[PDB]
């Protein structure tokens, strides 16, 4: 596998989003993963509707909108629904709304999704290199996470109990520290313009490889 990968270099990563006070991290993680696949299949980079997932991938999928959800069940909703609207057509309002999906605004589809084996960072590396960005959950409860500004994030107090959904868009090494390149959804003000480099091959740090999944078209 290549020593390093950065899907932003291949134009498969949309601009960083800001979820605000709505706990839609799972929705942003899911659309982020599908956006790359859409680019790989059609050649067009298009932001997909996280709001669409918040309002429509609800109870039947075990999700709670602005109060949390799963990336995998979001993917299944897209499969079942036979589509997902573009961000431009179904904008993000950071609130729970009635489902307003309309196929006339469909910007992507999904045929299946894959969940990687638990805590296997080399399997995650392979998927990021050969498939594309991967949705993951991390333990972002620690004060140090919110204050991350640069370098490679390593927190002694991190655990494998994940609570925040994000997107792995690459990996590599900085000044001897192997890392996973993570796209967050707390706006461009967070970390390095919306991104955070998290420790890689350090015992599944912060549970980054605990529950990885990616969609396909
Ligand atoms: C995001 N703003 C937020 N977290 C979540 O929604 C997480 C997503 S996760 O940590 O990536 N992960 C997905 C794979 O399973 C483990 C968790 N999910 C919540 C959640 C799930 C289902 C639900 F109905 C409500 C919340 C949790 F971490 F609790 F499992 C809201 C802060």
Resolution (A): 1.7
Instruction: Report the nearest-CA residue for atom 23 of ligand 1.
Output: 69
* Closest ligand 1 atom to Cα of 24: 2
Q: For ligand 1, is residue 162 a contact (CB within 6 Å)?
A: yes
Experimentally, the structure was elucidated by X-ray
Q: Separation of 72 CA from ligand 1 center, angstroms?
A: 11
Helix 71-81, helix 25-42: angle, nearest 10: 50
CATH of the domain at 6: 3.90.70.10
How far is the first Cα of the chain from the last one, in angstroms, to the nearest whole number?
23
* Closest ligand 1 atom to Cα of 64: 24
Calculate the CA 105 to chain-centre distance: 22
Q: Could you give the number of structural domains in the chain?
A: 1
Do the bridges between strand 195-199 and strand 152-153 make them parallel or antiparallel, or are there none, so unpaired? Answer: parallel
Q: For ligand 1, is residue 131 a contact (CB within 6 Å)?
A: no
Domain containing residue 174: 1-217
Q: For ligand 1, is residue 135 a contact (CB within 6 Å)?
A: no
101 and 108 Cβ atoms separated by less than 8 Å: no
């Amino acid at each position: 596998l290549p020593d390093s990968v950065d899907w932003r270099e291949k134009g498969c990563v949309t601009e960083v989003k800001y979820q605000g006070s709505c706990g839609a991290c799972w929705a942003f993680s899911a659309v982020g993963a599908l956006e790359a696949q859409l680019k790989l299949k059609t050649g067009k980079l298009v932001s997909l509707s996280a709001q669409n997932l918040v309002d429509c991938s609800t109870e039947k999928y075990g999700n709670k909108g602005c109060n949390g959800g799963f990336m995998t069940t979001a993917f299944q909703y897209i499969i079942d629904n036979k589509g997902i609207d573009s961000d431009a057509s179904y904008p993000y309002k950071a609130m729970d709304q009635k489902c307003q999906y309309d196929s006339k605004y469909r910007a992507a589809t999904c045929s299946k999704y894959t969940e990687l084996p638990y805590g296997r960072e080399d399997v995650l590396k392979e998927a990021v290199a050969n498939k594309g960005p991967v949705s993951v959950g991390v333990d972002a409860r620690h004060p140090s996470f919110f204050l991350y500004r640069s370098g490679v994030y390593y927190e002694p107090s991190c655990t494998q109990n994940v609570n925040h959904g994000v997107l792995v868009v690459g990996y590599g090494d900085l000044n001897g520290k192997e890392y996973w390149l993570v796209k967050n959804s707390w706006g461009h003000n967070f970390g390095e313009e919306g991104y955070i480099r998290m420790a890689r091959n350090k015992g599944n740090h912060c549970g980054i490889a605990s529950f990885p999944s990616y969609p396909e078209i």
